[PDB]
Design a protein around this ligand. Structure first.
Ligand SMILES: CC(C)(COP(=O)(O)OP(=O)(O)OC[C@H]1O[C@@H](n2cnc3c(N)ncnc32)[C@H](O)[C@@H]1OP(=O)(O)O)[C@@H](O)C(=O)NCCC(=O)NCCSO
Length: 145
């Protein structure tokens, strides 16, 4: 897997295909892409973008740490999962975040992906909640100090 910077617009196709296929493409144009300091990473394999992840500064009222970042749009294409594409994006992002002085990385994780974030050292906080129309989510976080 090769991890490279990508632009926000480069994420829409895979966000749409993997995360939100039953909504218009506009549902994948996350407003948070337009928040200060947002950045995006792609994982490439055999000449194809196959994994994506997006990060921006956002301090969650319920997590402790002066500077926090949120992960959105975490997805790897079927056929290319279980290759450490996702893990590679997260580790690369952790370097960028640590260099920026961020204290923690959090996600409103799909409960179906909770084991993935667990393997990457995230913890669950609070209770499972629903996010229309994309189902059960749970707050998860990793302290990176
Ligand atoms: C969740 C994921 C992004 C994972 O991507 P990946 O590239 O396959 O991850 P990876 O780095 O190869 O996997 C890392 C580890 O977690 C495990 N893992 C991956 N997906 C998992 C899941 N859904 N549940 C539990 N464990 C998982 C892998 O088996 C691997 O474990 P080992 O090291 O023990 O073999 C991908 O399966 C996916 O896109 N799923 C559908 C969309 C989704 O749910 N995205 C997350 C939304 S959170 O807001």
């Amino acid at each position: 897997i090769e991890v490279k910077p990508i632009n926000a617009e480069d994420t829409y196709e895979l966000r749409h295909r993997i995360l939100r296929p039953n909504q218009p493409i506009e549902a994948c144009m996350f407003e948070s892409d337009l928040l200060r300091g947002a950045f995006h990473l792609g994982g490439y394999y055999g000449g194809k973008l196959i994994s994506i992840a997006s990060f921006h500064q956002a301090e969650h009222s319920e997590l402790q740490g002066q500077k926090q970042y949120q992960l959105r749009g975490m997805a790897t294409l079927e056929g290319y999962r279980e290759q450490k594409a996702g893990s590679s994006l997260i580790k690369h992002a952790e370097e960028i975040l640590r260099k920026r002085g961020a204290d923690l990385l959090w996600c409103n994780a799909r409960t179906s992906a909770s084991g993935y974030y667990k393997k990457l050292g995230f913890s669950e906080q609070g209770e499972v909640f629903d996010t229309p129309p994309v189902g059960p989510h749970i707050l998860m976080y990793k302290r990176i100090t």
